[PDB]
Amino acid sequence: MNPIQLDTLLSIIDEGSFEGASLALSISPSAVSQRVKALEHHVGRVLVSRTQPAKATEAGEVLVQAARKMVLLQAETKAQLSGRLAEIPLTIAINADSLSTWFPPVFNEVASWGGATLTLRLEDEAHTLSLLRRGDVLGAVTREANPVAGCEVVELGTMRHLAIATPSLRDAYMVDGKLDWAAMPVLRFGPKDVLQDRDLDGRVDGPVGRRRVSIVPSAEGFGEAIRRGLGWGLLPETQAAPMLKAGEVILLDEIPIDTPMYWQRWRLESRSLARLTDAVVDAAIEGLRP
Amino acid sequence: MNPIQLDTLLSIIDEGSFEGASLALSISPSAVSQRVKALEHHVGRVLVSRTQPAKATEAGEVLVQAARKMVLLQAETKAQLSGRLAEIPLTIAINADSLSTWFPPVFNEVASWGGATLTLRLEDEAHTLSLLRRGDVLGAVTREANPVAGCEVVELGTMRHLAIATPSLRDAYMVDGKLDWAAMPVLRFGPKDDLDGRVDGPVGRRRVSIVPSAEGFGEAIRRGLGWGLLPETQAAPMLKAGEVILLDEIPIDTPMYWQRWRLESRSLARLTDAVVDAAIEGLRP
Numbered sequence A: 001m002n003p004i005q006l007d008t009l010l011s012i013i014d015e016g017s018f019e020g021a022s023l024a025l026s027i028s029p030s031a032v033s034q035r036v037k038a039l040e041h042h043v044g045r046v047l048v049s050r051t052q053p054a055k056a057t058e059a060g061e062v063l064v065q066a067a068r069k070m071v072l073l074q075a076e077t078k079a080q081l082s083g084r085l086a087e088i089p090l091t092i093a094i095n096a097d098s099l100s101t102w103f104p105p106v107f108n109e110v111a112s113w114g115g116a117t118l119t120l121r122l123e124d125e126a127h128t129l130s131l132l133r134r135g136d137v138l139g140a141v142t143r144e145a146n147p148v149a150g151c152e153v154v155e156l157g158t159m160r161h162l163a164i165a166t167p168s169l170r171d172a173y174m175v176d177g178k179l180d181w182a183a184m185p186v187l188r189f190g191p192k193d194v195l196q197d198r199d200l201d202g203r204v205d206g207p208v209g210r211r212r213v214s215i216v217p218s219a220e221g222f223g224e225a226i227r228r229g230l231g232w233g234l235l236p237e238t239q240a241a242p243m244l245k246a247g248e249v250i251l252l253d254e255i256p257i258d259t260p261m262y263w264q265r266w267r268l269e270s271r272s273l274a275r276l277t278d279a280v281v282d283a284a285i286e287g288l289r290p
Numbered sequence B: 001m002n003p004i005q006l007d008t009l010l011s012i013i014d015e016g017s018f019e020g021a022s023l024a025l026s027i028s029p030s031a032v033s034q035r036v037k038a039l040e041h042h043v044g045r046v047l048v049s050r051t052q053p054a055k056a057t058e059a060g061e062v063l064v065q066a067a068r069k070m071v072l073l074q075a076e077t078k079a080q081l082s083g084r085l086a087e088i089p090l091t092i093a094i095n096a097d098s099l100s101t102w103f104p105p106v107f108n109e110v111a112s113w114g115g116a117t118l119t120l121r122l123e124d125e126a127h128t129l130s131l132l133r134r135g136d137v138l139g140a141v142t143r144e145a146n147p148v149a150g151c152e153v154v155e156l157g158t159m160r161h162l163a164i165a166t167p168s169l170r171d172a173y174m175v176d177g178k179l180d181w182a183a184m185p186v187l188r189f190g191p192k193d194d195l196d197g198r199v200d201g202p203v204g205r206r207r208v209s210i211v212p213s214a215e216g217f218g219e220a221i222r223r224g225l226g227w228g229l230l231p232e233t234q235a236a237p238m239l240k241a242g243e244v245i246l247l248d249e250i251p252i253d254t255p256m257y258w259q260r261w262r263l264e265s266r267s268l269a270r271l272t273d274a275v276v277d278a279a280i281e282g283l284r285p
């Protein structure tokens, strides 16, 4: 049954006449009658008297009672929703390399809103977009530039990786003035690492023999293992700058690997989301290259 | 909040996809998407997944529960006009320990209502609350006192568990006049299911049997396979028959609650009375 008609019937009783419901609802007296007749025709029963003060019939008393029940439900739901939104964390898919460099400043902005919470899911660039598409996150950092259906994209800047190692490690694999890339132990970030898979492209020509690999599945532990000579690795220039400045590591190579990054968020008129987006863009501007 | 849009979101979930809602509602696929977009802009959150099967987000669960509440009201109203008994299915989450002790008397009451059905779901504590939140059950017996969004809570009383074993089993694990709790085989209802204040230091490995039914769990203790924590209601006959003894004068007490949708529902009110009355008759204060 049409709940607007139920409301119309209720207004008639609460206000006492058809004209009273008309003025209360800001609808014509004709509209009230149309709704009542429809509801009565839908039910198969006469529901209310056309006299004044208006009295509900036996069947009509049912719908009036029902209408007040639905009115109470609607009000309780609105209040319940308002409170749950506050409690529910905004969900983001992000990669470890963004989280370990330029992103943490976003935390400051969310903290100042007063009660907001974040849920970060750590995913590589490719996997990140699927979480957005399916709706499991409201925003996502991704290498993919084309917008997924329902979402808008903003460019954040470019992430640069450097091939770094400790000076001692490099010298250990210098022979005849040329570096033996294949023999040099390398750091890998996970058992699935796309970067470390293609880390010799344009450094070695033919088929590569077997490598010496250590795996450290945290951005900071990964950097520490390189920092400490366990292997060379591809490290975000943000992370490498202090080690290079302190002379703990050196550049093995003037050839960076560049990855443009984007922010994708569901299109919704949410000021919460708008604020989060601005915070992300602003953080990436400060910690990525133009 | 537009009530038509709530129906559409619910249809997406019930039918499993946006296309399913399209066919179910006789509206274009574009209309389904437009209605969701509008509803999402009103809330400020994504409400349902764009995958199949469609799942409500955390925010979406609020609206889905609300939509199912409205469906229940509509059904009770239709039943009142009809001049015939309602025949409304009531879906409940319950724990095995309640179902096997104090709950069954509810069956008599529900049966007497004419036409109505029960769908009981036996669920662990965590999933039980999730079902309530998203609207997959309208009521639940639970150890959780804090109300899930959209629900009201009623205290039912306290469930007492006793640590029991057969005399022969206890004697078998007496060592120098002291019982070796860690070495004694124990019963468990599942792989996710007890020595706190029974052992001080580090616990070694245990020997565990798993029996995933309340009565077989009890039967295994009764028959010496292991000790276990058993509801005093279940244990009383075994204790009276001398089949088991108390390993411990300290019971473990668990307060119980009834959580129900906040709704002016005559079915829900009636079910609550039946549940509360059963708990009054078979649980401790």
Ligand SMILES: NC(=[NH2+])NCCC[C@H](N)C(=O)O
Pocket (backbone or CB within 6 Å): A094, A095, A096, A097, A098, A123, A124, A125, A187, A188, A189, A193, A195, A196, A233, A234, A235, A236
């Ligand atoms: N060899 C490496 N440096 N691998 C880094 C993998 C980190 C991954 N791209 C992420 O940001 O989540």
